[PDB]
Design a protein around this ligand. Structure first.
Ligand SMILES: *[C@@H]1O[C@H](CO)[C@@H](O[C@@H]2O[C@H](CO)[C@@H](O)[C@H](O)[C@H]2NC(C)=O)[C@H](O)[C@H]1NC(C)=O
Ligand SMILES: [Cl-]
Ligand SMILES: [Cl-]
Ligand SMILES: [Cl-]
Ligand SMILES: [Cl-]
Ligand SMILES: [Cl-]
Lengths: 127, 121, 193
């Protein structure tokens, strides 16, 4: 399955951005979806996760209520709305998918928990 | 952790031989492995030889053919016969036991205190 | 007072998976903050990890052991494979979280660390949370083994043999499985709330 990201780019501190990630194929309602970020000089780290039905969300400790993850299964797309952006948020942002085989997955935060990745989009928050 | 007793070791002339022994005493635990590692003054710890459950013997490449490990047939002691010793075999040798409490699976693994082996004229 | 998760996660020694360790967590206040600060796997089933500090459970278990990196995916409800089938099995209705990290720096050694074992063969799959530490010879073919190894007759445990140059899928990973059980009984393992 191919994951393709859009959105992102440059923004002024305190502004907002929406990222999206569209999946190929017909299995998208099977997937737990995650967003990860990779900032200059650090490894990739979890940002947000959402269950296959959208019933459960999960946010890293640095989100602090600022970002919303959402999905539209009828468009094969997961979204990350990012508000009140800080320069600390500058990073390459990745989409990722993992199949919820048991139907009960409510969080997935490890780099090794996902098998398919989007290409990464640069997000830059300027002072 | 399990209580270990090591014996043997010390100084030997190059080409000579030494026998190390490592005894694990007591009861109430199940043994997964008993063996020897070694660590030379600069370098990291490496396997020498070990015996795992089922009497499976594993050797490091640097000792295969010169060292022999064996299990005592009447107690939980393993022996390392070191033959044809050479200066590079000089190291601290450590008994290395993996075991667990047979009732509550508490991990009891232990390194020995280490025994110096010095191969020099 | 504070629940001793540190004794589990930061234990210097971990169990072989076939002899996996269970620690029961009870009569204590559970601070889950350490989960949000590191791990290569962190999947939860039926529970939201950021809610744990406001939740109460009747039993909490922490199960721990070492497996290969490419086996961590078998520590999940519904999985199959030698580890899920023959060593450590989660129930379909598992509620809890599975946490793992690469432990190459502690659990491998030059020339190989053979101290960690797993069960390669079994006549039937484990039931959820079953532990098998038996060492009968496994009959893989039609001929009875009569307790002796031979063609088609195998000792059932195998050593991983972790070497620091193994590919990351074959390196050792330490795993902690946290079970949060909400039973028909008072729920006395709570977060700070
Ligand atoms: C296992 O040990 C680590 C290292 O001591 C603990 O992590 C530290 O926790 C304190 C207080 O929570 C923090 O101030 C440090 O920043 C942490 N250090 C690191 C490197 O993360 C960890 O809490 C322990 N695990 C458990 C379950 O108690
Ligand atoms: Cl948040
Ligand atoms: Cl939807
Ligand atoms: Cl929950
Ligand atoms: Cl069986
Ligand atoms: Cl690999």
């Amino acid at each position: 399955v191919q994951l393709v990201e859009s959105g992102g780019g440059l923004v002024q501190a305190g502004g907002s951005l929406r990222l999206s990630c569209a999946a190929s194929g017909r299995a998208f309602s099977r997937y737990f979806m995650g967003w990860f970020r990779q900032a200059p000089g650090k490894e990739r780290e979890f940002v947000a996760g959402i269950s296959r039905s959208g019933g459960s969300t999960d946010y890293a400790n640095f989100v602090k209520g600022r970002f919303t993850i959402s999905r539209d299964n009828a468009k094969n797309t997961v979204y990350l709305q990012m508000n009140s952006l800080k320069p600390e948020d500058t990073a390459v942002y990745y989409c990722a998918a993992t199949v919820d085989y048991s139907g009960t997955l409510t969080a997935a935060r490890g780099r090794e928990d996902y098998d398919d990745w989007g290409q990464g989009i640069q997000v830059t928050v300027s002072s | 952790e399990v209580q270990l007793v090591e014996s043997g070791g010390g100084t030997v002339q190059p080409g000579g031989s030494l026998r190390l022994s490592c005894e694990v005493s007591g009861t109430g635990f199940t043994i997964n492995a008993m063996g020897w590692d070694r660590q030379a003054p600069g370098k990291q710890r490496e396997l020498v030889a070990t015996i795992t459950r089922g009497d499976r013997i594993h050797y490091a490449d640097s000792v295969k053919g010169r060292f022999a490990i064996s299990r005592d047939k009447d107690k939980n002691t393993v022996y390392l016969e070191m033959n044809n010793l050479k200066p590079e075999d000089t190291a601290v040798y450590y008994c290395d036991v993996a075991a667990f409490d047979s009732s509550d699976y508490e991990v009891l693994d232990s390194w020995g205190q280490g025994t110096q082996v010095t191969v020099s004229s | 007072n504070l629940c001793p998760f540190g004794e589990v996660f930061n234990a210097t020694r971990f169990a072989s998976v076939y002899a996996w360790n269970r620690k029961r967590i009870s009569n204590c206040v559970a601070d889950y903050s350490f989960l949000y600060n590191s791990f290569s796997t962190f999947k939860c089933y039926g529970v939201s990890p950021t809610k744990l500090n406001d939740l109460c459970f009747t039993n909490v278990y922490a199960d721990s052991f070492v497996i290969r990196g490419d086996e961590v995916r078998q520590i999940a409800p519904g999985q199959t494979g030698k580890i899920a089938d023959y060593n450590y099995k989660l129930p379909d209705d598992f509620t809890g979280c599975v946490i793992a990290w690469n432990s190459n720096n502690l659990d491998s050694k030059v020339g190989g660390n053979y101290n960690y074992l797993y069960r390669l063969f079994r006549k039937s799959n484990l039931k959820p949370f079953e532990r098998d530490i038996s060492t009968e010879i496994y009959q893989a073919g039609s001929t009875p083994c009569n307790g002796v190894e031979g063609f088609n007759c195998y000792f059932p445990l195998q050593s991983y043999g972790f070497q620091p140059t193994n590919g990351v899928g074959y390196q050792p990973y330490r795993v902690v499985v946290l079970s949060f059980e909400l039973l028909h009984a008072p729920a006395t393992v709570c977060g700070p709330k």
